[PDB]
C-alpha cells in the first residue's frame, strides 16, 4: 500500500538521520577517549617504573605476587557497555569470557564474576551464573574513581582467601579505529619477569605493599580507559 | 542446637504427616478425574451408536 | 489468532452472562492496551514497576486464550477461565505453564466443585458465596501444581635470578 | 584445654544450628516437592488412563 | 485564542505539539528503542504516552464496552489537567492510571488504586 | 495433530513460531544486525537461521546443476532432526553447515569437513 | 557486470566444453561466497587468515574475469585465464 510504504521511507529517512548523527559523534568520542587514554599514559609508565625500582629492592613476599596453593576460585571483571547500538562490541567481550571461562574451568578453577557495564550484566542476568558485584554507570566516560573502587574490590576478594585464588579482566583493546579485539588479561597474582640490567623512604617492602593496590588500580584504569575508546 | 534439631525433627514429622495428607488427597482427585473420564468415554460411545 | 486490537464487538457487554461480564468486562482493552505496550517495550532495557506487572499479566491472558481446535469450553468453564487471569490468580504461574494450569484447574473443579459450574449455569452469575469458593480452591490448587519451575602482567627486576 | 573445649563446642554447636535449621526448612521444602511430583504424576496418570478408556470406548 | 482564550489555546497547541514529536519519534522507538534518545526527548515521550491515554474516555454509550458507568469533565478542568500533563506534573503517576479515566479526581482514585 | 501425530504437530508448530518471530525480526535485522537484539530474541534467530538453512536440501532434480547427488530424508528423521534443532541441540554448529545436506548423519559429516 | 546467484544457465552445463567445467566448476561458488565474505568483512576489523586469503582469491578473480570491449576471448584461451585464477597461481 502507497500510505504505508510512504510511513515506511518517512521512518527511514528518520533514523538515517539519527544514525548518521551517532556516526558523527562516535568520531568525536574515540578522539576524547584517545586523548584520555594519551593523558593517562604518563603516569602508568611511571608507576610501571617505580614498582620495578621497589621490586628490585623488595623481598617479593607480597600476597599478589605468589600463587595460592588451592586454585579454588578465579575472579573475572568483565568490562562492556552501558548504552546500546555498539554492534559486536559487547559480543565479542562476551565471547572472549566464556572461552576464559571454558579454559579456566578446565584447569579446574569455577569463575566468579565482576561486571562492568550493563549490558553483560544483562547477558549474566540471563544465563544463570551469578554476578557477585556490579558497576553501570560510567563505561563511556570512567573516571579514576570509579576504577579505585573497582581495584578495591578485586584485591580484597584476592586477599580475603568467600576469596579468589587468582583474577583477571576481559575487555576490548584499543589498538587502532580500524582494529580492535576483545582481550583477556591475567591481573592477579602478578608475574614477575626477570631480566638484564635507589634510597626507600620508610623501607622498600613498606612501599610495595602500599604501590601494588595502586598498580592494580591504575592496570584498571587504564583497561576500562582502552574499553571505553574501543566502545566508542 | 537442641533448638535447631527439635525443628529439624518437627519439619520432618509435619512434612511426612502432610505428605500423608497430600498424597490422600492426590489419590481422591486422580480416582475423580477417572470417573469422569469413565463417564466421558460413556457419552462418546453414545454419540458413536 | 484474533487481533485483539482491530477485533471488536460493538453489542459488547450486552451479548454475555452476568458472570462474563463481571470477570471479562474490560479484557479486549486490557489486552489491546497489552499488544501496543509490548510493542513498545520491546526494546527497552528496563521498565517501571506497574509496567512490568502489566507486561507479565498480558502474557498470563494470550496464554489463558490459546485453545486447540474442537475444544469448545461451556459458558461455566468459560468464567472460571478467565476468572484466573482477570483477577490475577495466574500472575504466579510461569507463562509457560498457563494452559496446563488451566486445564488441570478445570479438570479439578469439575471432580470436586461442580457445584461452582452449577451455581453459573443456573443463576448466570458468579455470587460472592461463589468467588469465595472458587478462590479458595484456586488457592488450594496452587499448592498441587507442579509447574516447571593468557599474557601475564609482570613485575620487572634490574639483577639476575637466584640458582 | 576444657575452656578450649567450651569455646569449640560453642562454635561448632552455633555453626551446627544454622546448617540444621537451614536443614529443617531444605527436608520440609524438598518433601514437598517430591509430595507434589507425585500428586502431579498420579493426577496425570489418572488422566492418561481415562483417555485411554475413552479411546477404547 | 480570540475565542477559545489563550489558556486554552497554548494547551491545545502544546498537546498537538507533544504527541506530533511522538508521532515523529514512534519510527525511532520501534527500532533503536527508548533509551538512546535525549532526556527531554524521552522526558517528552513519558508526556506524550500519558497524555494519549488521558485522551480516552469512559462515555456513557460504551457502558456495555467497559462495564463503567460513563463521564462528563468540564472543560475548566479538562484545561487545568492537559496543562498539568504538558508541564509534567503527573510523570510520579503509572501510565496506565490515566486510561479510560473521567478527570482528576477519576485519575487520583485510580493512581491510588494500583 | 490428529492425522500427522501429537510429536510432528509440536515439532512443526515449535519451527513455525521461530521462523515467525525470525520474520517479525528482519526489521530490526536489515538495519542494526543480529547483536543490537536482547538475548532471548538473539539465541531464538541464532537457531532460526540454522533451521531456515536445513529446511534446505540436496533434491535428485538437483545433480544436473551442482553435480553432487540427491538425497531421500525420511519423516522420522525430519521430526527427530527439527525437535533437536528447535530444543537447541545443534547451536555450536556454523549455519554453514546446514546448506543443502539431507538428515542427521550427514549434517555430522559436514560439519566434521567444516 | 555479471551479478552472479542471481545470473545463472539452467541448460548450460550440459554443453560447456570438458576442459572448462574442469576449470570453473567450483568458481561460480567461489565468487558467491566471496561476494558475501567482502559484504561482511567490508565492516569488520580483522578476520581469519584463511578466510583473509579466501578474500583475496576472490578479489584476484573478479579482476580476472572483467575484459575490455570488442574483445571476444577463445576458449583456447579463456580455459587457460581461468586456470590462472582457480588454481592459484594469481595469489
Known sequence: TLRELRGRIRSAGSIKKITKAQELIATSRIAKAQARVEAARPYAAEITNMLTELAGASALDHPLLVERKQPKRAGVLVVSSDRGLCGAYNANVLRRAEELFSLLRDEGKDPVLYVVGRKALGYFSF????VVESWTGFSERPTYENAREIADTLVNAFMAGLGVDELHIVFTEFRSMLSQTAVARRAAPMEVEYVGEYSFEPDPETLFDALLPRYIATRVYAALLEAAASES | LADA????????????????????????????????????????????? | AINVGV??????????????????????????????????????????????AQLDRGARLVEL??????????????????????????????????????????????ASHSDIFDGIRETKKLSEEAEEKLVSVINEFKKGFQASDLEKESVKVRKPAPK | ??????????????????????????????????????????????????????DEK | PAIVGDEHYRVAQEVIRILQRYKDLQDIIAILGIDELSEEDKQLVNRARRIERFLSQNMMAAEQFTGQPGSTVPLKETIEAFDKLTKGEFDHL????????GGLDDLAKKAESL
Request: proline fraction near 2%.
Open chain 3, 7 to 52: 477485533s471488536v464487538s460493538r453489542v459488547g457487554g450486552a451479548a454475555q452472562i452476568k458472570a462474563m461480564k463481571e470477570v471479562a468486562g474490560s479484557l479486549r482493552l486490557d489486552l489491546s492496551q497489552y499488544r501496543e505496550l509490548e510493542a513498545f517495550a520491546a526494546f527497552a532495557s528496563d521498565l517501571d514497576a506497574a509496567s512490568k
Open chain 3, 65 to 110: 486464550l490459546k485453545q486447540p481446535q474442537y475444544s469448545p469450553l461451556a459458558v461455566e468453564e468459560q468464567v472460571v477461565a478467565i476468572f484466573l487471569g482477570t483477577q490475577g490468580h495466574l500472575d504466579s504461574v510461569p507463562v509457560e505453564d498457563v494452559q496446563r494450569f488451566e486445564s488441570e484447574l478445570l479438570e479439578h473443579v469439575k
Open chain 2, 5 to 49: 534439631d527439635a525443628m529439624h525433627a518437627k519439619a520432618l514429622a509435619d512434612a511426612k504427616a502432610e505428605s500423608e495428607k497430600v498424597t490422600e488427597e492426590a489419590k481422591q482427585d486422580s480416582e475423580r478425574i477417572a470417573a469422569q473420564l469413565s463417564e466421558q468415554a460413556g457419552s462418546e460411545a453414545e454419540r458413536i451408536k
Open chain 5, 94 to 101: 503509572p501510565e496506565q492510571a490515566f486510561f479510560l479515566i
Open chain 1, 127 to 130: 544465563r544463570q551464573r551469578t
Open chain 4, 1 to 54: 584445654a576444657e575452656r578450649e573445649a567450651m569455646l569449640a563446642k560453642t562454635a561448632a554447636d552455633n555453626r551446627k544450628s544454622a546448617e540444621q535449621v537451614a536443614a529443617a526448612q531444605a527436608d520440609y521444602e524438598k518433601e514437598m516437592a517430591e509430595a507434589r511430583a507425585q500428586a502431579s504424576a498420579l493426577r496425570d496418570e489418572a488422566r492418561a488412563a481415562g483417555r485411554s478408556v475413552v
